[PDB]
Ligand binder design. Structure first.
Ligand code: 2VU
Length: 251
């Protein structure tokens, strides 16, 4: 499995913050991403078990639309995660430049994500934290799931009424997330977005959303199908991949 230390990698530009830095393995010249987690931070938050879960889950996941976790290592105060480098950055950054995506680009990201989520659910692994900042873009502009920190409570967006209400939940949480993600992709903002945490809770709880005029009948239908209060009423990933709007606009 290879034994690693800090003295094996040349650190560079910070790629993101939660931090993750650009790194080069000195011997192989291998470009990767180093997520640097402080032990004292994980101690004062009691999330050490949650990190182990993420490490165990992502290291055994193998799919072209899932970012690879090559390995881990720790020192006296820090914990390091050797992650795959996504050359084209986050989906969040992309959406900020473009404002919103077209039906073609949206349906392709949805397909790529639904496929990756189906691979995850077949292994009984539920993502729970699907959002643009946790999604990356590979060398070919393919969508890739990066963060797996909540795999098996800041912004409520993307979380279904089950999780926010503390009730038990299925793989269906990721289907709701898919619906939130499809809307955000086409509109430019998530469907339950509010100024306060308290208002976002109400928007989610009572499923309040309205489509702007430009959102098409086909896109409206899939989003409506995915944003159901009852998780049993949510369509399966196979139903989404074979949805008319998806197949008509997907690559
Ligand atoms: N300035 C600038 C700029 C503008 C455009 C493109 C790029 C290239 N770019 C590549 C990345 N890649 C990553 O950020 C990245 N690559 N691999 C990652 C893994 C995680 C990660 C954190 N937890 N789990 C995974 C998080 C982030 C990453 C970001 N920008 C940089």
């Amino acid at each position: 499995k290879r034994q690693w230390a800090l003295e094996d990698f040349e650190i560079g530009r910070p790629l993101g913050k939660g931090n993750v830095y650009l790194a080069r393995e000195k011997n192989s010249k291998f470009i990767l991403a180093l997520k640097v987690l402080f032990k004292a931070q994980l101690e004062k938050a009691g999330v050490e078990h949650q990190l182990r879960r993420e490490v165990e889950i992502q290291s055994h996941l193998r799919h072209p639309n899932i970012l690879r976790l090559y390995g881990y290592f720790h020192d006296s105060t820090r914990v390091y995660l050797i992650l795959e480098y996504a050359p084209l950055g986050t989906v969040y950054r992309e959406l900020q430049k473009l404002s919103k995506f077209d039906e073609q680009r949206t349906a392709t990201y949805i397909t790529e994500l639904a496929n990756a989520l189906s691979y995850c659910h077949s292994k009984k692994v539920i993502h729970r934290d699907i959002k643009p900042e946790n999604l990356l873009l590979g060398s070919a502009g393919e969508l890739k799931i990066a963060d797996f920190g909540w795999s098996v409570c800041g912004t409520l967006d993307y979380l279904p009424p089950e999780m926010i209400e503390g009730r038990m939940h299925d793989e269906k949480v990721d289907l709701w997330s898919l619906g939130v993600l499809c809307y955000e992709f086409l509109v430019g903002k998530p469907p339950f977005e509010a100024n306060t945490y308290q208002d976002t809770y109400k928007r989610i709880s009572r499923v309040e959303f309205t489509f702007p005029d430009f959102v098409t009948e086909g896109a409206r239908d899939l989003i409506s199908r995915l944003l159901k209060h009852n998780p049993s009423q949510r369509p399966m990933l196979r139903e989404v991949l074979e949805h008319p709007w998806i197949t008509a606009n997907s690559s």
